């Protein structure tokens, strides 16, 4: 069993495994690079979805303030005998107009709240895609280091076997010369 032809075939089988592990390391390094890019695009989308949410939140803040400012005019307006009959007459004359102004502002406010609601869902989806992109980059990095350690382990086994084949071939050429000289 301990023939040089068998030892050479053993190095050839070990070296084929080493070649396969090298091929897997290169392919998995490409996966880590692809995943690294996907993380950056998903993080950009999540940052852009946060800007859309901040813009919509500010618009809600403005719409709420416009309703408060309309209510403040109506309240300050309401706040002498003939002068109080005149205040009530004026307020009752503009009452339905004040209701229509307020209804318009309330509808505008709900429309901004609906835009923010859609944006909140888009922010949650973008964050979930950014977290899923990181989960893939982490699963690819961990798979690459596992193939890299199997590769390092196989490279040392191939070096050990090739050193044995080289030493046996060196002993064969030396033994052939000692026999040939006699």
């Amino acid at each position: 069993t301990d023939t040089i032809a068998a030892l050479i075939a053993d190095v050839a089988k070990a070296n084929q495994r080493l070649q396969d592990l090298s091929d897997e390391v290169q392919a998995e390094q490409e996966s880590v690079n692809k995943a690294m890019v996907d993380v950056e695009t998903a993080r950009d989308n999540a940052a852009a979805a946060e800007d859309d949410l901040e813009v919509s939140q500010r618009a809600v803040k403005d719409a709420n303030a416009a309703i408060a400012a309309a209510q403040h005019r109506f309240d300050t307006f309401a706040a002498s005998p003939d002068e109080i009959i005149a205040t009530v007459t004026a307020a009752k004359t503009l009452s339905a107009s004040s209701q229509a102004v307020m209804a318009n502002l309330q509808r505008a406010r709900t429309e901004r709240v609906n835009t923010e609601s859609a944006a909140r869902l888009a922010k949650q989806k973008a964050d979930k895609a950014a977290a899923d992109a990181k989960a893939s980059q982490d699963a690819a990095v961990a798979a690459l280091t596992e193939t890299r350690r199997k590769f390092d382990e196989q490279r040392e086994e191939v070096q050990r076997l090739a050193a044995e084949r080289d030493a046996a071939q060196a002993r064969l050429q030396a033994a052939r010369l000692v026999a040939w000289s006699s």
Binding site: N64, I67, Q71, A103, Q106, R107, R109, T110, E111, V113, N114, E116, S117, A118, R120, L121, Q124
Partner: protein
Amino acid sequence: KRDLYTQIDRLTDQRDALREKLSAADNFDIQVGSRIVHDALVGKSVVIFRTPDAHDDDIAAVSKIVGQAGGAVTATVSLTQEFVEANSAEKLRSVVNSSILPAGSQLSTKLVDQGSQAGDLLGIALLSNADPAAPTVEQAQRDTVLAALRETGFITYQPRDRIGTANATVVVTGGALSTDAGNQGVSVARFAAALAPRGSGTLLAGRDGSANRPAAVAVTRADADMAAEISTVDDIDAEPGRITVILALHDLINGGHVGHYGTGHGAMSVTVS
């Protein structure tokens, strides 16, 4: 006739005979109630809303008949006096038009009164849209809407935890309103109308006298828009009225047919056909 004594006795005997016939008629209806509503709500769920003037015995009768129909009651939400009086309208709308609106859900932008907006948000939280494209609201999302409306004093609810989604809804009121409490009719009629598109049908049920203004049932029947959006019952205080809540809820869930039932003003018939 000038025989006043014999008229009183004859009228007392006639009234007493009708009272006996009526007690028997109501006992007949209680005893066959489960036969009438058999399979009317099988696989379906109902969320109950009640106003401060609604009677506990009506809520309990509706909830018992839902069970007889093969259905379930997900919760009984009590609309507080702070909600129905409509004097906290802006506080209400600032709660509804906030981040409590489940992410991605859209509030209706048509009617902006506090009744319509509260029913629209509670319809999102507690009902299942007949449209599969609409969002499925999570348990945590529903609880958020409920706790915000309960901390601000608009609603009270049982059970306090793990409330499920409902197919249809009943809004239960009392009878006649005093003219000074007229705001309660409009706010509850609009509240009930805004729940109609959020699920598979809303029935607004009131006790005798609810078919008269300013009560919610009368406000609904007199408004062409609301009279076309929700069904009504004006005699929930009586057993035929309680059975009709379930029979007309069946019609809404299976076909969407709207009707106005009872013995009062604007009622098209006593019950479904």
